[model samples]
Target chain A: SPGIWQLDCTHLEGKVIIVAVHVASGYIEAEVIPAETGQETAYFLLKLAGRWPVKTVHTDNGSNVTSTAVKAACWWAGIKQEVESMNKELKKIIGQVRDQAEHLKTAVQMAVFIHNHKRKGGIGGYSAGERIVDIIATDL
Target chain B: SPGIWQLDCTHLEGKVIIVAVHVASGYIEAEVIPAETGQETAYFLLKLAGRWPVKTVHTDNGSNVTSTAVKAACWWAGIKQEFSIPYNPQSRGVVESMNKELKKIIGQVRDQAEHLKTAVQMAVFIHNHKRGYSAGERIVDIIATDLQ
Candidate 1:
């Protein structure tokens, strides 16, 4: 039930995959072979949402995610898909810190979390999960 | 009546030209030219020797020296040209040392000695009578001074 989980792809084909984690409860769900066509994605989402009570999904803006099938799937399920900006600035900061800091791993993780939660206009000044819900309501 | 003068022309050209000095009396006689060519080098060598008598010549087997013009000049002068082994050419350590000294004095300055004659003569004077190493021997004195 951890919010973050390493989705195992060994069991699935080497197709596009996403793992969605529930922030507060830490519950995790993964979708593999997320459809090749927009229509196929709609069918897959109808089936996935039927099984899981997932409300929000976060993923990189990959072609498979933006595909018509996947977008239709999200619309059908009334689930919101939120994309965070590519982590270029965060990566640069981490790279600078890594050269000088000993506890780089912990520091980077904490920094990312704080940046997502505290920075103005970042996740609406709340944790990314809470901000996702807020953003969905604003969009609605 | 004629003699060979050994030469080293490692750093010559630009605004600063360096000539290798003879160690005993601290006089440099050869000025290396920036570019190497048979005719130009032979003329430079002739100008380098000037009124000085050259009977025999010893040098490394550089193609520039063995060129048609240089060989012809040596033949005309009746000077026997002898070449040293490539590996042991610097057996004439004094010449090598002079080359090193010239580089140090010139430091980073640009060498403007384009013509071999002027550059070589200047290097010789600087090497021999330069305030420090000449030991009070003038250019003429050093050349006239016999080496036992």
Candidate 2:
């Protein structure tokens, strides 16, 4: 954290998908939003508080991402021109699902599931999903 | 973290009991410190980082628990702090749960323990490995599987 949660928003077919990455945990949350206003982005950010204690949100320079409405919800600090790589991966995954289904929201959700569950390095092979549980017993 | 790691410094016979608990998986690392200070607090935290990727630390407002030195270590690692309510056992239940067991185990091992540290180490080993962990199944073994 530094209270860190990375945030970026992308669009598919004129609608917005607000995605947030738990930088420390490697876990992410993405949702479809009907609008791209700070109100909408702020709402999405607030939703994340239920999952973990959100002290600060690392965000990109999206107009809504840095809006006062967003900060009204929590602390928002912009980051290096980062989070694009994650968005790229997210886009590629959603692109693949587009062939099988036309539902953008469902595809985004499915992408999140894979992103969180796939085990990776830096987190001791536990999936992004397992990090909550990865602070494990050294031997056991 | 099952995304959250609860950190609390408890006292044992005038010494500090550094209990780090994984709230989700119920894993533990309880060690003894001769004195209760931020340096000791930071040491244990860095020790945990060597073994796991630590992000957020849930702690109370204890003097050393929130010490500026401890803050520096966490800041170096970009770790965040989630403070528990002062004297609120309910908010930090997982850590409290393990503390109780750790204390009990310390007493039980007194028969064979050479010192308080020995028993506490045994308690950590026992708690972390109790469920089929004795047969050599370990969290690091899980790490091996990731590579294999």
Candidate 3:
């Protein structure tokens, strides 16, 4: 409820992985898939939302995100849909990791952990994890 | 004088082509390149601009367009460089329209051609020669004369 979640996908050795990042907390969730089908994308969104309450989702105009089934799924889940640009930094970081075919899952997990733990200059030097913890502690 | 010319590149069948379109007349010039490098792109810009007097040129923030050599060449040619916001095609609508037309035409003849380059060339010719506005006016003809 604090802010929207940014959803995107990237390729690792020709395979695709869907990623979702909470805009307010930078908390990330990702899953690998052979292709970015509408059903699979919707399923991933549902799974991520089951863990964290998602009020709105933002993504590019990719075919999977724009598909009728995916739209209906979002409607059923009570999640609002918004269009935004792709996440370039996620793709760039994924591109740097070696042995993508074998280590993509762990590589993405590690990237997400590091990103949430690192202090951001733009956010007055508070790590994303720290922000989330503070919000949870304050219940605001 | 004609307005600024917008430059961009798009790919088809894994081949890249540099495209330059006059903003006022929609006249298009395109060339297939072996690779998209700063030198190749700068050379293509020079070749296209040499045929007509270009006062200003625009392009997206692609590496080839923003390279030191390309910037130097634009400076030497007395052409002002204008870069559009990255990932926004509407900012450079003229050349983006040309690219769409090029891709549509190339798609039609892609399966019939022995060489993709030939098909791309034919698409460019067809695009430039099509009549517009008047009974006998083509983009090529419009761009031939100075608008001023």
The TM-scores of all predictions, comma-separated, are 0.38, 0.47, 0.46
Worst 10 residues of 3 chain B by lDDT: B132-141
What would the per-residue lDDT of candidate 1 be over residues B9-50, giving only the tens digit for each residue?
574444323232333444454444456666656654543332
lDDT of 1: 0.44
Off by over 4 Å in 3: A1-140, B85-89, B133-148
* Per-residue error (Å), model 2, residue A101: 54
Q: Residue A59, candidate 1: how far off, in angstroms? A: 92
Candidate 2 clashes between residue pairs 3 or more apart in a chain or in different chains: A1-A4, A132-B1, A132-B2, A132-B3, A133-B2, A140-B139, B1-B4
iRMSD of all candidate structures: 44.4, 15.2, 27.7
Candidate 3 structure quality by residue, lDDT tens digits, A1-140? 45468888877667787878777666555556678887677766653443334679988898999888678667755679981233456555556644442366545544454455543666557666455444433333
Best by TM-score: 2
Docking class of 1: incorrect
Q: What's the TM-score, to 2 decimals, of chain B in model 1?
A: 0.66
* Candidate 3 interface CA RMSD, Å: 27.7
Binned by DockQ into CAPRI classes (incorrect, acceptable, medium, high), candidate 3 is incorrect
DockQ of each: 0.00, 0.01, 0.01
What ordering of candidates by lDDT runs from best to worst?
2, 3, 1
Query: Which runs in model 1 stand beyond 4 Å of their true positions?
Result: A1-140, B1-4, B12-24, B30-34, B85-92, B108-124, B131-148
Higher-ranked by lDDT: 1 or 3: 3
